[PDB]
Structure formats: structure tokens, C-alpha cells
Amino acid sequence: VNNKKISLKISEATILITKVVRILELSSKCQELITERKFFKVLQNLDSLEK
Amino acid sequence: FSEQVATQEVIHSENVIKLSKDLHTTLLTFDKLDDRLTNVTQVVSPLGD
């Protein structure tokens, strides 16, 4: 239970990291989809995101 | 923290301590074991005899 504790913070930490990663990517796609009636950084930042 | 190190303290300290005490008492048990075995086969000389 000290290894369930350390294991719990371990996999909690790693899943927190990957959750932060996908949060960043979907956050960037939200930054893409937010831009309406601009059409200029659309292909720039959006095509940067899809890269 | 010292819940986990309390498992190190009680579990490691008591495990090592009563490991030596219980295993040494088990060595006294093995002394009684070879005692009764020696008296056993020594009484079992009349079997072959």
C-alpha cells in the first residue's frame, strides 16, 4: 500500500501528463475552430496544428 | 510519508526483530527435533536387533 501509494501517484502522474498533452492538442484545435470571420491565421495556425 | 515509513518501521523493524526471535526459537525447536530423533532411532536399535 506504500507501493499502491507510489504506484497511484506514479500512474496518476503519467496519466496527468498525457491528459495535459491531449488537453493541449484539443485546446489548439479549439483555438482553430474559434476563429470565425478571420480566414487568415486559419490555414496558418490550423495547418500548424494538423502538423 | 511516514505512513509508508511507518510500514517500514513496524513492518521492517518488527519483521526483522520477531524474525530473529521466532527463527531462533525455531532453532530451539529444531534442537528438540534432533533430540527426539536421536532418542527415537536410538530406541530403534532394538528394531534391527
Determination approach? cryo-EM
Resolution (Å units)? 15.0
- Which one-letter amino acid corresponds to residue A40? F
> Are A5 and B7 a contacting pair at CB < 8 A?
no
Dist. CA B45–CA B12, nearest whole Å: 48
Contact A5/B at CB under 8 A: yes
Which residues in chain A touch residue B8, judged by CB atoms under 8 angstroms apart?
Answer: 2
Cell of B41: 532411532
Lookup result for grid cell 511507518: B6
CA distances from B11 to B2, B5, B14, B16, B19 (A): 12, 9, 5, 8, 11
